[PDB]
Symmetry: C4
Subunit: 297 residues, 4 copies
Amino acid sequence: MLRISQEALTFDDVLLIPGYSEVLPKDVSLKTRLTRGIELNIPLVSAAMDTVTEARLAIAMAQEGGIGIIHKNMGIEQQAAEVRKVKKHTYPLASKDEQGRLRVGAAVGTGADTGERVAALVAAGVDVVVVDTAHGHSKGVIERVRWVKQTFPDVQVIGGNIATAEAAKALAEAGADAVKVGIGPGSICTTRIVAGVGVPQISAIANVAAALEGTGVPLIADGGIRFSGDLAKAMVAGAYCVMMGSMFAGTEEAPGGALSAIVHQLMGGLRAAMGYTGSADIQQMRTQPQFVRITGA
Amino acid sequence: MLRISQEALTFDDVLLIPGYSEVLPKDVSLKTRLTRGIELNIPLVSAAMDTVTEARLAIAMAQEGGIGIIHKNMGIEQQAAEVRKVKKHTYPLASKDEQGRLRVGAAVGTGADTGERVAALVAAGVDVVVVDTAHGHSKGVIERVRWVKQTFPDVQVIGGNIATAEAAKALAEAGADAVKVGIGPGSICTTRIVAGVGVPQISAIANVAAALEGTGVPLIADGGIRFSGDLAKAMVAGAYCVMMGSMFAGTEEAPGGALSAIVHQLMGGLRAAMGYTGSADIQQMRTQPQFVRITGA
Amino acid sequence: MLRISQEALTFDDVLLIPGYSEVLPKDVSLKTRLTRGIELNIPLVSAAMDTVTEARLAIAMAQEGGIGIIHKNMGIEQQAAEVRKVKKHTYPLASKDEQGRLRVGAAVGTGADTGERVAALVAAGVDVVVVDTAHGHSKGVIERVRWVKQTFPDVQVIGGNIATAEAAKALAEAGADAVKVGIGPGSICTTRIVAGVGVPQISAIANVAAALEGTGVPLIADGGIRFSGDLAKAMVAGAYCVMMGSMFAGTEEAPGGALSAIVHQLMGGLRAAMGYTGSADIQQMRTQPQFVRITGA
Amino acid sequence: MLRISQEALTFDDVLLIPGYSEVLPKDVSLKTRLTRGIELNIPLVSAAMDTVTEARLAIAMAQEGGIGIIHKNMGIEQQAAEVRKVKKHTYPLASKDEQGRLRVGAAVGTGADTGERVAALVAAGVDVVVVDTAHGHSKGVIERVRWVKQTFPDVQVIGGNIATAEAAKALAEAGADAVKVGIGPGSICTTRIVAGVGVPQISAIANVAAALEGTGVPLIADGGIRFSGDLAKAMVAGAYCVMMGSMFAGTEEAPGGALSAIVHQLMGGLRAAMGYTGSADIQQMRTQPQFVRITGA
Ligand SMILES: O=c1[nH]cnc2c1ncn2[C@@H]1O[C@H](COP(=O)(O)O)[C@@H](O)[C@H]1O
Ligand SMILES: O=c1[nH]cnc2c1ncn2[C@@H]1O[C@H](COP(=O)(O)O)[C@@H](O)[C@H]1O
Ligand SMILES: O=c1[nH]cnc2c1ncn2[C@@H]1O[C@H](COP(=O)(O)O)[C@@H](O)[C@H]1O
Ligand SMILES: O=c1[nH]cnc2c1ncn2[C@@H]1O[C@H](COP(=O)(O)O)[C@@H](O)[C@H]1O
Ligand SMILES: [Mg+2]
Ligand SMILES: [Mg+2]
Ligand SMILES: [Mg+2]
Ligand SMILES: [Mg+2]
Ligand SMILES: [Mg+2]
Ligand SMILES: [Mg+2]
Ligand SMILES: [Mg+2]
Ligand SMILES: [Mg+2]
């Protein structure tokens, strides 16, 4: 009578099966979407962590073809200033808005300052507001996502974090332009030890991807990626892109080597996986390849 | 032809799935029952171990809104004296009887001294007698539970330890006001190594909770809890409250830091779990949230 | 298309479920059978290993109520002499033949000396001949078992080692008075590493016990027992008794503390298990209690 | 909605079940095929690695009754010269062509030099060309296999590496005389860590063997074998022979003890497994014995 919904799988539970391939790793397309309205040339997002993303690293992420989410452990005036630095800043893949400015995102919470914070970020020219808490399937987050969409209809909004189909549907209904997936996997996050709560990330991604199929709402896989192999698996489970934190934290660009080298490795691995599965682009990678389930052995 | 009843799960086999939430962790209700007749403001009980509960720690447990079970590795006269110390002793959550005295429990076994021991404890004003052995699904325990209920009808009686539906039904039929669950999990208890006997505690709790549904008989989860996360899982599997031993053993109040700090952490974690699952009170937490099963990976 | 017969379980895969109990550990019966014709007061046999059983330890085993199998890494004349020492040697449980002599067994192989070896052992008064090789489901062993039964009908004969129902039936048909179970589990035996061959011992025991049900042919569980808990599980899976090697190897009685202390511990644990399962005797222990299957966690 | 094809098993997931046996290990036949046209007296192939197979070790492998595949991390002229050394070189089991010359194979890739490389190797008298890449289920490999078969019909050709039924069928259709199985298991190969790609080798072998049943196309198990036990399991899963790399790398014969000692051990273990399963020859070993699946425990 124990209420078990399903067996749920993490990265180490699965491997990608090779499939017939004609397109070499160097030739596949990595283009994807962050949100309904924002495209990325690589499926990489940097985390809204105070050890990872401020203006310097967000500029670098945008130049690489991804995007950075400025963390919110700072005052409103400073966070707006971080956004302005990016917006005012050869990188052929660079993520840019219609005015040719580098794209940037910024995190907000649900606390008392949120309305004022969102307004300041929008005024600073932020491309996307990320309503970002430990539990996105909540009145607080869902209300705030709807408020941002209704109040600032010209900005993109992301809600998270979630790990279920029901949560995905709730955020989509609130007007989210993308959802962020990950409850438990944050490299350690002591969510499992302290609250006993979590959903293994491969299942979490797949369940959200299935819920959002046909909606046009992207999903971002946030947490638990240690190697480029995990990144490839996240994509095949259905993620549109992956958010990384601690792997970027030691870099020259992160707050007190080069980020470019880590990005190159990560995308090298993803390209290798696409070659193995015969996936010519991200849409194929998300929808066609298969996994095998493996044992502890 | 190997006689396997089921696959049985322990704490590390499962995680709680987040659900829609509106009530913040700080605002949920932790009120529950220890027995048919005894309510607790927090779902915490201290173990009847000689390294854990004598009068000092039992007083502290009652003040925190839980209860202590005085251990029985002492003479009858001393155990009665321990009970009197608690009964004769701002704590707004304090567990108190109808006379405004702090509640306390006391353990007895099945040996020759039991009748005299029970009589002395009852005379000392004990709120609940815990008939407490390694194997509660036994003639000795079931007979003693019935005897206490028939002889001292105004005292509460707990029987344990058990790990099966059949055992739960047997104790309920004997007149138990609550049952205590745990064969194997006692942090090590060498029951598994020496006798090869045990039932993984999440399954044990769920099986007992199902057997007792609609009876009004609470069940206490005893053993194996290392982190607040385990406590949350125990509740969702169906426990009314949790008994802890070794985690309290190092405290200022335990027999030769403060117990309050550990209680605060444990309840903090439970509150976090209730927030994640959208459980506003313990009755909801016990009956509504779901688990995912996870692999070793 | 991989040819997998079943999932097979070892000791650590299972735990015994407690059942209603009235008979205390100190009061249960440990009496069992080694073979069709030989009874034992405890379900313990010492291994035919040159670090475990020569006359000294076999005498001690018989006195304890079990039996020793003299190893065969010695000349025929010495092995007969070892047997004579036991046969010619307060121990109320002692295993004795109809003449009041301590019982003893002796191992033989399938090599050229076997006929002469068996004849010498029988002449020396051996109670049971153990035809003992790494692979008992073989022409060599099955032929030798039939030969011993036809040539020396008044001696008991054991064949092994086996791990399948088919093998059990083959030895029973050859006239074996008991079969010995264990391919792989010998504490390390590098059978799994070198040949990739083995059957997890709990499944091996259960499969053999099912094959032999109603035949009157006992089965001996040989190998892999590290703790008294494993011994209890072996019995509930269907073993009539257990053979131990390395656990006895360090003892005062084994070839270059007391064996009695280890026997006392092992039987103490088995008694505890019988108490937990409510098994009053070995026949009940073999046939009534249930297991739960558990995870790595 | 996670796209999982199957649960897939590796060596440590399974054990061989003993079966009725009459043929001793020393008496079983180890004869098998490398390709449609090439027979081997033992089922052993050395890897095309620059730490494993050049002329010296390939000569030794052929003398032992197996074959070596000369690695391709060298110029065309040197690789042809390596082949000539073997072709121009008591060993009763020696692998020889119709002219009495030791057999040898050589690896090629898919790069620009392949046509010229293949021509030079064929002119040098190579017995088999191995079109050898990380992903054999690819346009590059399948095209090259067909080209070699159509251009040099008198040479044997192997394609690999693959891990699926579909891939096996594709190579067979291209004209491959054998396929090589292994994506992931190469002792570490960081294919799993970097690309997240792989198929546990026991399942990979069985799936390919099933696809090729009745075609006359052999399959070679390449990678992941640490012990002779793994070798036996690979055969029973359906491999015709096994390719080994790192285990040979430290030997006197490998590029900067004796290879013979390692071969003797490996075949000793395989012989032991055939004895346990009652397999008199390789065809029996491949098709008749069964596995049990085992747990982490
Ligand atoms: O201080 C924190 N608060 C909340 N979430 C965090 C914090 N640090 C890391 N995380 C989570 O963990 C993710 C990073 O995971 P990582 O790539 O494994 O380091 C973030 O994007 C967040 O979702
Ligand atoms: O000395 C003992 N005898 C019997 N049970 C014990 C003893 N010590 C601990 N336990 C059990 O283990 C539980 C404590 O588990 P813990 O919270 O993991 O330390 C107790 O409530 C008892 O059920
Ligand atoms: O040298 C040996 N040859 C064959 N079998 C052995 C040898 N040593 C131990 N065994 C096996 O392993 C069993 C002992 O297992 P143990 O109680 O785990 O030490 C023996 O009864 C034998 O079945
Ligand atoms: O440098 C390499 N490139 C490609 N494959 C390799 C390399 N080294 C080892 N392998 C693979 O790993 C196999 C050897 O596996 P091993 O017997 O476990 O050492 C080779 O036959 C190859 O399939
Ligand atoms: Mg900073
Ligand atoms: Mg700073
Ligand atoms: Mg004391
Ligand atoms: Mg004291
Ligand atoms: Mg000796
Ligand atoms: Mg000696
Ligand atoms: Mg070289
Ligand atoms: Mg060299």
